[model samples]
Every structure is written in structure tokens, then in C-alpha cells.
Target chain A: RIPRIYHPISLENQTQCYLSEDAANHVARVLRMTEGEQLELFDGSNHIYPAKIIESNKKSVKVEILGRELADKESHLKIHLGQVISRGERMEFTIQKSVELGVNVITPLWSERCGVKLDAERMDKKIQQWQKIAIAACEQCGRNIVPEIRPLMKLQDWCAENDGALKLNLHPRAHYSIKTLPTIPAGGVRLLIGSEGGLSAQEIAQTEQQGFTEILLGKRVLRTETASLAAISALQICFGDLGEA
Target chain B: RIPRIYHPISLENQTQCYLSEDAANHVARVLRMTEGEQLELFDGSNHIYPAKIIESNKKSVKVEILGRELADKESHLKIHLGQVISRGERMEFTIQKSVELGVNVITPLWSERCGVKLDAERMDKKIQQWQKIAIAACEQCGRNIVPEIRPLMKLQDWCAENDGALKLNLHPRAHYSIKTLPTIPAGGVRLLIGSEGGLSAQEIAQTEQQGFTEILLGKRVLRTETASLAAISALQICFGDLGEAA
Candidate 1:
């Protein structure tokens, strides 16, 4: 199996094509590609195409197609996570695992308990960085499509955007379990989880009032990073493709 | 606040108590706890005694007990986890979280895919380190009793030790969930999780023949570290203290 790239190429319906300059430079310089190297490429679309490096040049590389197949996504559950931004490694870990769990969308919400304050510019940069991590996670996990990592927004603004689906906020006080959640359409599930200290009482109340139900993972207070991934995993096990053979 | 030590201490009927030598040194030398400072002490039992320091010395420390309260034990679920030890930090994280989740006993199981291998002497040292970590996690999570961290063992031996209770082996191919289990008696639950690459198929079959059931976590393949912790967390939520409020 050949390696896959994220960006698109100008390959026709033919079995052979020339790689873009960026891809060519990456193949020759980065991956040290030579003549007669076989590989595969995939765009964000759910397709994995095959190819082999026929001509190797630092400026431009050409490859011949070998095979192609539609990618299979691991998760059948649609999960959207609204997580409060945590500090350094914790935040990065959340983004990476969310992608691995087949999260459909991610929104970094600013909550009262959030400690790391990212200004507008820094928030943009962090989102881009998290998107890169998501891409890498998808590529490694064989996820056909990359999950969306949205810019950080205030908790109230995010709650406004998410109105009527089966919305759940993770808090210790909630008496609901993921297994007990009401069934919804085949679209996706939205889960809101807090950051370092977790969502404050006021924010949870706001979410509760805005049609989001409170749910608990268990009696123990999960760390901010653990809550998102665990919730996504449990939800998948309950309603998603997790139960499928 | 004064830093308390884990050494067991017997308390007299009076409102005051004397600290053990280790606790004394920790108070006087390490923490430098001064007189009239408040401190909390536990004896690996369910009771926590709060006291104010009456005397501080290099040899011994004395405190006048103000009050004692019952520290809540985890629900009757007896959790014994056979976790394959990972590298230094990941292994530590697993131990810490398992303690917080109220595990009754933990054994560091040696498996084929486990990245780190320790000799007998090194394994002894590693157990001592993990013991300290379990205690610290107990202190942080408000558990009165520190869970036991057993010595490192091979997967085969550990499987044999889990005599009769419900034993589960977590893997991707397993076709079961925790919620579907028959109602276990209040005695407890036993879980066995593999290391990075997961348990060998031969090991799984052996464990299964020994009456251990195979279980799956979800669709996505989790990293070795995440699998153990997540399974433990989910188990507690599904059958133990976690699902209580729900």
C-alpha cells in the first residue's frame, strides 16, 4: 500500500500522473523517493487512490496509478465535541484523540474555568495547529475524512449555535448516562465538555437552559482531557458503528 | 496545612495523638510543619483524623486530634486490574487514574507487547514506586484506604489468580459490552487489559478458557495507554459508583 497525501493532485482518469510541486518536493526530498516507488494518495474526500513514483525530481515528481478504493470510517456514530480549551499538552491530546474517535466536529468553547487565554491571533494559530493534528490522526487511523476543529468561541455563543439536537454537557452532577440518551437522527451527536477546572455551575446552568441536557460519565470527576475522549468512545459504543462487527 | 505521612498510627481515646517516626520527620524536616498547624492523617483504613500539631521534633511529632470523620470507601465493587506496564510516565498515569477510579487491587502484568522489561530487582523497585503513586492518588481523590499494587507478574499467572469472579479481557475483536454482563454479586469485578500491541491471541484464548470473557471497547483502536484507563472508567460508570447518581 502506498502512502497517502492530504492535498489534491491534477491526476486525470488515467493510471499515471505528475504530482504537484509541493507533493513532488515532499516525495523526493522529505520522503527520499526514487524511481519505481509505489504509494497511494487520498484527498479529504473518502477515497484512497493508488500510485507509484515513476519519475523522481526535487522540483516535480510523477507517479502511476495502481489501485483505488473507498475508505471505511471506523465510527458509525456522529459525535460533535464542544470542549473548553485546556493548557498545552492536554489541549493537544484532546484534539488528537477526538479525531481518532471519529468526532464529526469540534468547537473549542471559552468557559469560566478555562485558564489558558488565547487571544484572537493565538486562537487562530492554535486552531490551525489542532487541524494539523486532526489531519495526522485521520491519516494514521484510516479515517476517510478529517474532523472540523473550529475557532475558540465563548460558551454562550456556542450554545446559541447548537439549539435543538440531542445535546449533552458533561458534568459530575448530571444523573444521565450516555446509554440512556434518547435516540436521534442518523446525523450526529453533540457533546459539550469543559476544560482544566471544568465548566462552572453558571455555565452548566446556561447549557441546561439552552436545551442541552446534563450527563455524567461516572461518579468520578474525569480530568478535562479524559472527559471528551471517553464520552466520544462511550457514545460510539452505544449508538454508533462501534457495535457493528 | 501540614503534610501528612502514610505510615499507620494508632490513636488513643484522647483528643491527641502521636505521629510515627516517618511522619515526624516528614513534619519536622521535610514539610517543616510548625506547632498549631492543622494536618490530616490516615491509617490505610476508612477513618481520617484531623489534628493540630502540638509538638514537632526530628524524632517524633505530636498532634492533638480535633475530630475524625469516616472516609468513604469505594462502592462494594472489587476491581482487580491486570494492566500491562507501559513506559515510565504512561504506566504512572494508568496507576494514578485506576486508583482514582477506586480499584481494589492492581497488578502490573508482563505481556509480549509491553515496551519495558524489568528484572526481578527492577520490578521490585518499580512496585515500590507504584505503591507510592497509588497512595498519593488516594490522598488526592479522598479515598481513605490506599489500593494495593501487587508485584509484577506474567499474564498467565495473573489469569490463574483470578479464581472465580467475573473476569474480562478487553480487545477490539471481543463482541461484548460491560452493560450486557449478568448481574455480578456485590463482591466485585475483575478486568484484564493488554499493553501497547495488545495481548497475544494465544494469551486471550488461555484467559478465555480460564473463564475470562472477552470484551470490546469501541470501533476505533485506542492507544495502549488510553485503552486501560478508558475501560476502567467505563466499567466504573457502567456498574460501579459512577452510574449511581444516574
Candidate 2:
């Protein structure tokens, strides 16, 4: 497989640029790619450039951008996932799978049912970690635009700020299903999912007050990690680029 | 949360029964339940009984079955998943997620691109292991019927015997997506998924010859585990009892 690397540099029609320090180390040290090796580089934009290693050193790797083309793997639906923080590695798994399922933005939520607690300093580190995981997922899943992993936010606060035309909360006891919802409009969906214990009754009400319709996936109780991916896959199928010819 | 246990014993209208040795140890030692403690037991069928531990010991724990009711979480669609076996925990993950998605049967297949190799003796142990995982998934996901995890078989052999009315193979470059398929019949789906390297061109041809329709999930390439679960979810949403109001 050709190495696909994400650089945090501007990649708009640039013919020559140096990889970022981290990406430089990755190509030069970890990947051990020598000069004249071919690779693909993306800059969190919609385009990917096929580039060659012009200079390979321990500290820096210089790349000559051959050309760029639009990476066509993106979904037409702009999905923003408000995932409540869960225990252990579930949150990380959600990030990886959501990126693969075509989510555009992920915000880690702090809810009443969330057991994982983090201070501001710790939350910043966690956001960076999730961003790195999302970028790595983009590299593996052939996504050019890296999904944004927002900093952790309180559930109520996040609900207040959410502005998707079609907002849904995965509640098992909801009166309606995603199938029964109105057709997704131009603005796409904002989906909120709770943690292991799920959102409190009050949290669910708050989200509903903010125009979030509660919807059920199925009769079975999907775990917090499974709920988001399944919902995103179904969303893409119904309204996005998933089932498009 | 009340502890849920899966016992192989028959659970019809019986009032009292002895727990299976494995379940006995789990309740007696792992869960540390004592006499008069309440728990739910399922006999791998479609009913769960509210039972109480009448006796709890290191070697045996007996329970009194109060009553039985039909499990409501079962999907109306009967889904049989013929998943190409992958390495490490990916197979286990597939079984767990498939059960959670209401898959009724799981068969681990050995394909040309399969990486895992096992002898007969070890394969038996691995099947038992996967069966245990499926049962645990049923217990966790409120499934009454424990999905059967069949022994590993060659992909050709499994494909030839498949009887699903609608059969699908997850192919990234397939001509049709799942959405374009004809309406599902009374009989459910038989979904075949390839391993890490995916099915070879010849293998794909063979499956197609056996009436497997190649279907794509989305633009992004899904891993082996992701493909099966996503396909099952889509199947449930379209033809099964997934989104139905109870």
C-alpha cells in the first residue's frame, strides 16, 4: 500500500512543501522512506496530492507535490456526532468507526450518566488524542478531509449550540424511529448519543427541547459505541452518498 | 442490574431446575450470589424466566423458576451470517455485534484469502469459544434466542448449502448496492463477508455462481467486521423488525 500521510500544512496547489514535524518524523523515522519514494499527502482539505520524497532526513522530510485531485470518498451528508464519553476504549473505537462511517464532526459529550470525568487540562490532551486517532482513521479509510474532534462539552451546552436541521437523539423508548422522521434537508443531521448508562431523563428532555427528536435504532439495545455507527450508516444510506450510484 | 444467565437446561413450565455447571460457578463464585437471590435465566430458546437461587454452593446452585414469558427483543428477520474468519479478536467482535444486530445464525468460513489456520482439534475449541461469545452477547443485548455459531467450513461448501432467499456478498466494487436489491422474501438473508484480503476474483465468481449477489455498503471500504454488522443493520432496517414499534 502506498503511504498516505496527513500534513497540517496548506495543500492548495502548492508544488513543493515540507511535511510537518510529526509527519516528517513518521515518514523519515517510522516509515523509513528514503528520498524519491512516492506517497499521498492530504491537508485536512478535500484534496489529496500524490507527492514524492525529495529529501529524507532524520529531522525533516521534503516532498515535491506532483498534483492534486478531489478525494471522492466523502459522504454528501454532513454528520456531527455528539458522543457521550464512555469508559475504557469504547470512545476511541467510536471515533475510529464514526470516521469510517462518514461522520464529519465528533464532539465528546459530558453527561449526567457519563462516568468518565476529565478536567480542562486533561480534556485538552484527550481531544488531541482523539484528533490523532481520527487522522489515522482518515489515512486508513481513504478519507481526505479529517473529521474534527471537538473538545469535550457538557451535554446541555452542546445541545444548546447544536444547529443541524435534522437533530436526533438515540433513545430506545422514543415514540418515533429514524425511518419516520422527515426527509433530511440541506443542513444534514446532528446525532447525540449517550454513554454506557445512557442519558438521564432530564438530559433527554433538554435535547428534545432544543429540537432534537428522539429516535430508536431497533428493538435491540445497542451499546453506546454501536449506536452511533449504526445510526450513521443508516443515515448515509437513506439520505447521503452511501447508496448513491 | 439483575444477573442474566444462559443455561442449556430445558426451560418450559418447570418450576425448579439445577443450573448448568458453568452457570453455577458463575453465579456462585463469580457473581457471589447466595440463597434467595433473584436472577434471570434463559435456556437458549426464546423465553426468559425470573428465577431465584434456592441453593448456592461451589459446585452447584439450584434455582426456582417463577414463570416464563416470551422474549420481545428478537428480530422477525432470520439472518444467517457466513463470515469469513479473520485473525485474533475480529471474529469474536463480528459474532458479538452480529448477535446484537439480531443475526440468528453465524458460520465461520475458511476462504482462499483467510489468514487463520487451525487443526481439527483446535478448531473445535475455537468454535466452542465463539459459541460462548455469542451466548454472552445474547445475555448482554437482551436476545432470547442464542445465535448458533456453526463450525468452520470451506467457503465453497458453505455457499453451496446456503438456503437464504436473498443472499449477499460484501464487495466494494460490486455493481449493486443493498438498497437496489429486490424486496426481501419470507425467508431471510444469508450475508457472506470476506476476510482481510477479501475474496479473490475467482472466489467472487464462485459465490456469484451460487446465487450470491455482490452488494456494496458505502463508498468507504469497511473492514471485515464492519461490513457484516453494517450489512445486518441495513437488512434489519429494510426488511426486518428493527425499526418497528413494539
Candidate 3:
């Protein structure tokens, strides 16, 4: 696979662009590529441009755009996930896996029963880290668009603001299943998943009041991380572009 | 949720039984439960018996069997996964997630491109650890029956022996997707997944010869761990008892 870097640049009607500092370091220092080496660049837009290293130096590397084409790997259904922040590396893992599963947007949530807590200063740092993870995931998964890692927010605030064709929250004892939901069209779907401790009953009631349907995956109890991945995969298969031929 | 322990014991017409040494330690020392505290016990055979601590001590804790109820959480489809063992914790993570997704059996495979290599003694030790992981998964996922983690085998050996109504291998650039496959029935399905390095072309060909259809989850490439969990969840939604109304 070619090294596809998520270079945040304006690729509109431009033939040449200086690679960003991070991308240049990745190309020159990390990948150790000299002039005339090939790579692809996507700017979180629909198009990916093929380019070659025209100028290479310790400080910077310039790439001349060879050609460009629309990236066709993105899922048609626009899926968003509101994931409660988990401790340690679990949140990072969820963001990476959810990106690969074609999640369009992710919002790290803080719920009543969530165990991890971060102050504003640390929360910003964590958000930046999560953003990087999403970019790396897109680079590896062949996704042209980088899913946005929205600033961490309260689960109640997220529910109050979120709206979609189908909104779902995982409830272990819920009567409704994913199959019972309506088929997704252009409007897309929104999903919410809690952390290891799970959402408090009051929090669940709040989301329900805000129009989130409680859905169960199966009879078994899924962990916080597994619940999101499994729900996202199932959503993609049922309403997104996963299972389609 | 009361702590549910998987006790490998007989639940046939017994009014009282003593907890195993491990369970006794867990209940008395770990959980610190005294007499009359309630718990559930499953013997990995489709029934979970509710019980209370009748006697608690340093060595043994006796429980009065408060009758048994049929565990209704088993998936209708008996899904089996052939997962190529990855290095470190990834393999353990897959086993835990696979069990939660309703997989009935798991076979860790050693393929040409697999990274980790285990000798006979280490392999036996690893299998025992994986079995413990599976048991813990069953306890957590409300599964009455524990999924079996088979002995580690080579990819070639697994291909020759694996059979199911529908067999699938995850291929990133495959022509067919999961939806294109025929509906799975009573016989169940078998899925094969490669490791981080993935299966060699020759290994994929051998599995193809054994009637495994290459299927894609989506356009994006999935890591080995993500591939199996996603595929298993999708499979259960498509054919198993997961999506059904309970």
C-alpha cells in the first residue's frame, strides 16, 4: 500500500504544494524518501492526489501533484458515534476501530456513570491525541476523509444537540433490536455507547427523552469497547455500505 | 448483577453442593460474602443454578441449590472462528470479544505469515490461558455454556478439518461481500481470519480449495482483531438469534 498521508492543505486547482511539517517529517525523516519518490495525499476532503517528492531537505519537502481522483472508499451512510470516554487506551482503540468502520464523526462523551475524568487542560490534550489517531486510522484504512473527533462533551448535551434519521443507544435489557429499526437513507444514523460502568438509569432516561431509541445487540453483555464496534459494524451492514455487494 | 461463577460440577437433582476450592476462595476471600449471600453458578451445560452461601469458611463454602433455570442466552447459530494467533494481548482480546459475539468455538491458527511461534510446552500453557479467557467471557456475557478454545493448529490443518454451512475468509479486495452469501441455517457457519501479517496467498488458496468463500466487510481494510469481531457481529445479525425479538 502506498503511504497515504492526511495532509491538511488546499488541494483545489493546485499543481504543487509544500508538504506540511508533520507530513514532510514523515516523508523525509521517517520514511526517508528522497526526490522523485511517490506518495498520495488527502486533505480530509473527497479527493486524493497522487504526488511525487520534487524537493527534499532536512527542513521541508515539496511534492508536485501528478494527478487527482475522487476517493471512493467512504461509506455512503453518514454514521456518527457518541462514545463515553473510557480509561487508558480503550478510548483510543474505540476511535481507531470506529474510523475503520466508516464512522463519519465521533464525540467523546462524559456520562454520569463514566469513570474517567479530565480537566479542561488535559481534555484538550486528549482531544488532540484522539484527532491524530483518527488521521492515522484513515491513512491505514484507505479512507480519504478523516472522521472528526469532536471536543469532549457531556452525554446529555450531546443528546440534546444530536438529531438523525435513526438514533440508537445500547441497552442490555431493551426490547427493541437493531433489526427492528427503520432502514437508513440519506439522512444517516447516530449511535451512543456508554463506558465500562455504563450510563446511569437517569442518563439513559435523558437520552430517551431526547429521542434515542434503546436497542439491544443480543442476549449477551458486551463490554464498553466491544459494544461500539459491534454496533457500528452492524449499523454499517444494515444501513451503511458494509454488506452491500 | 450477582457474581456468577462457572463451576464445573453436576447440577442434576442436587439440593446442596459445596463450592470448588477456587470458587470457595473467590466467594469467601475475594468477594467476602458471608452466609445467606446469593449468587449464581453455571456448569457450562446450559443451566445456571441460583444459590446462597450456606457455610463460609477459610477452606470451603457450602451453598444450598435454589433450583436451576435454563440459560437462554446461547445463539441459535453455532458459530466457529479460526483465528490466526497474533502476538501478545491481541489474541486474548479476540478470544474475549469473539465469545461475547456468540461464537461457539475458536481455533487459534498458525499461518505462514503469523508472527508468534509457540513450542509444544508454551502452546499448551497458552491454550490453558485462552480457555480461562473464554470461561471469563462466558461469565461476563451471560452465556450459560462456555465456548471451547481448541488446541492451536497450523492453518493447513485447520482448513482440512473445518466445516460449516457457510465458511468465510475476510478478503479486503474480494468480489463478494457478506450480504451476498447464502443464508446460514441449522448447521451454522465457520469463519477464518488471518493475523496481523495476514495469510499468505498460498494459504488463502488452500482455504479456498476447502470451500471457504472470500468475503469483504467493507471497502476499508480491517485489522485482524477488528475483522473477526465485526464479521462475527454481522454474521449473528444476519442469521443468528441476535436480531430476533426475545
Candidate 4:
């Protein structure tokens, strides 16, 4: 069986190339791969390259490209997530599961009720970490195109960003259910999920004035992460390829 | 603010009673409640008791029942999950979430590929711990009727038991998606979720022989916990009270 490896750079024309330093350690030391071993490589380009190990060492591994083929794992109904950060591992869990559920874009947001606070320098590190989680999710879920992790934004700023996508927010007591949502536009959906403490009253009014629709999942009070994953699942069922034949 | 507590036993006629030893510590120490503070008690009977603490200490807290009201949190589409065990926190996560989603019954199972191994003595402890997690989730989600955590059984045994529920198993390559499934019977559903390593071919065949319908969630490979939660959420959306209006 060939292992699927994610290459950091483009592999469009090269007949042979070396993997990234991190990938090389994985290929050589971790996987104990040797010359002539087979591997499939993807570069977040919606394509996969069948490659063979040309050289193997502890520090580096070279691979000869065999061919390329289309990898169609991207969902047609794209989702852009505006998630107010949760605490610690919960935030990481949200990003990983969202990517696996076919989210195309994720922008971490700050809100009055969001408990976590971080400086720009610290957030930069967190963004890098979250982006890696997105890539790892893609590799595990057989997705070729990686999702973009947008820079940290204020909740209102992210909502105000110009996009043709349908804007929706999840509210436990809202009038509209997931089943009752209006016909989604061709531009897909931008989902706003607030913190566990729930959005402040002013922010709720802000989203409403900004034209964000409130959709309810159910009566049970789900935690922030549960709400996120459940909303994504329902969206995929209604608009995307989750339950596709 | 009043905290909702799950009473371990029936609270039918008692005007005043002492909270369970564990609950007393939670109410007195963790939550730091004093005398005359209000609390809601549920006995898994689809009813809630409006109670006030008459006496409070770190060890024993006594509550006087004020009144009772109906609590309706049960989902119409009753799901009985036969989940093949996963590792560590994942299994706990499944039980907690399943309770929140209104699963009526849960029977942890041992399949051929289920990677976890435990002895009978150790399993007793795990069953106790899991039941507590179910209660905690109910308290968190405001469910009055606690879901039953049945004794752990073998996967095949669970699949073969006599029941009127619509039996379904999630197969990644199965022909029918969740949306494409037939109408569920009135008895609700018996959902079989396999482990991360997946079920054996023979087990698949065994489930087929046992009249378990193979349903696919989607094309993408989901981790075991994801598949379980996704399936539960989808079922609730399709047939339960998840997206209902007043």
C-alpha cells in the first residue's frame, strides 16, 4: 500500500524532487521508506502525483514523479466559518472537524463574550498552528485542496466583509430552523458561530442589521463545538455533498 | 441561578430529602450553595422538582420540594446506539454527545476490530463512569428523562436481539446515503456504529443477515466519533425535534 504524502510546494513539472525537511523525516525515519518505494503526493492543487522514492536517507528522501491525476475532494457548496475562539483544545478541535466537514475558509474572531485573549504575536503562532491542523485534516480526509485560515478579526468586521455568500448565524431560540432555511445562493454560505457564553445583545443586533439569518438546530443546548459541527453537517446535507449519492 | 440536578432514585412523594452524597458535595462545595438557595431536581421521569436547600454542608445537603412541572426534552426519533468501542476520551465523548442528542438507549459493544480490551471487573467500573457522563450531559442539556446505558454486549449479540426498531449500519461504500434511507418504523432506530479500524467483512455479512440496512453518511472518510455524531445529528434533523418551531 502506498502512503499519501502532502508536499509543501507545487509538483506540476518536476520529474524528480526531494520532499520537505519535515516530510523527509517522516518518509525516511518514521515510515522507514527506501528506494523504489511508492508514494502519492498532493500539493493542495486539487491533484495528486504518483511518485517513487529515488533516494532514501535519514535526513532527506527524493522521489521520482510517475504521473498526475485529478483529486476531486472539494465540496461544491463552499463554507466560510467565522468562529469566535473557544478555549484551548476546543478551538483546535473546531478547526480540525470543520476542515473534515468541507469548510473552505476559517476566520477566527474576537467577541465580548469570547473568553480567550491573546496578543498579535501570540495569535500569529496560533494561526500557524490552526492552519497546520487544517492541512492535517485534509491529508487524513483525502482532500487535496487545503482550506484557508484567515487572520484574526473582530466579529463585526468579519460579518461586514464583502461577499456574495449567504450569511447565517446559529441561535438556539431563533425562529428559522435548519430545515426552514431559504434557498442558498450560488456563492455558498458564510457561517457565524459565537462563543459558548453566547453573543452579546449588541452583537446579535449587529448581525441582524448586517443581514445575517438566524438558524436553529434544535432545542437542546449544545456546546459551542457541538453547535459548529452539527450546523456544518446539516448544511452539507441540505446544500453540499455530505449525503450525496 | 438555579442548577439542575439528577436525583438517583424516585422522588415521587417526598416533601423533603437529602441529596445524594456525590450531589451534596457538588451542590455544597463545587457550586457553593447555601440554605434557601433554589435547585431543580430531575428523577429521569420526565418531570422536574422545584426544590430549595433547607440545610447545607460540604457533605450533606437537604432540599425541600416546592413543586413539580413537566419537562419535555426527549427526541421523537428514539435512537439506540450500538457503538463499537474506541480509545480513551473518544468513547466518553460519544456517550456525552449521544445523550445530548437524545439517544434513548446505549449499548457499548465489542466487535472483532474494536481495539479496546477490558476485563469484567474493569468494565463494571467503566459502565459506572459512563452512566455518570450520561447524567451529566442530561443535566447540561436540560433533559429530564435519562438515557439508559445498557450493559456492554458483543456486537453480533446486540445486532441480533429482537426489536421492532429500524436497524441500520453505516458503511462508507454503501449504496444508500442517510437521506436515501426508507421511512423509519415507529419503534425508532437501532444505529450500529463500528470502530475506527472498521468492521470485518464477515461482521458486515453478519449484520446483513441480521436485517441491518447499510446506510452511508457521505463519501469523505470520517473518524469514528465524527461518523457517530454526524449520523445522530442527521437522524435528528430528518425525523426528530431538532429544528422545530413553537
- Which candidate tops DockQ? 4
Say which prediction, candidate 2 or candidate 4, comes out ahead on TM-score: 4
Cα lDDT, model 2, residue B67: 88
lDDT of 1 at B238: 65
- Chain A TM-score compared with the true chain A, each model in order: 0.86, 0.94, 0.94, 0.95
Question: What local lDDT score does residue B171 receive in model 3, on the 0 to 100 scale?
Answer: 70
Worst 10 residues of 2 chain A by lDDT: A236-245
Put down candidate 2 lDDT per residue, B12-89, tens digits, no spaces: 989899988778888999999999999999987788999999999989999999989887788878888888876743
Fraction of the native A-B contacts that model 4 recovers: 0.55
Please identify which of the two predictions, 1 or 4, would achieve the higher DockQ against the true structure: 4
TM-score of each: 0.81, 0.94, 0.93, 0.96
lDDT of 1 by residue, B77-148 (tens): 778888887663377878877887778899888887677776999889988988888877766566777788
* Docking quality class, candidate 4: medium
Q: Rate the local accuracy (lDDT) of all candidates.
A: 0.73, 0.82, 0.83, 0.85
Ranking by DockQ: 4, 3, 2, 1
Best by the TM-score measure: 4
Tens digits of per-residue lDDT for model 4, A76-131: 88899999885742888889888888888999998777788778878889999999
Pairs that collide in candidate 1 are A2-A39, A2-A40, A15-A65, A76-A241, A219-B242, B78-B188
The runs of at least 3 residues in candidate 3 whose Cα sits more than 4 Å from the true structure, single-residue gaps closed, are B15-22, B57-60, B162-164, B173-175
Clashing pairs in 2: none
Per-residue lDDT over A124-216 for candidate 1, one digit per residue giving the tens place of the 0 to 100 score: 898888887887677666676778888888888888774345778876567777767768655567788887776777887788677887776
lDDT of 3 by residue, A96-205 (tens): 99999999999888876777766877888989999999999998888888889998888888888845457778876677777777566456887888888787888888
Clash counts for the predictions, in order = 6, 0, 0, 0
Candidate 4 chain B minimal-lDDT segment of 10 residues: B237-246
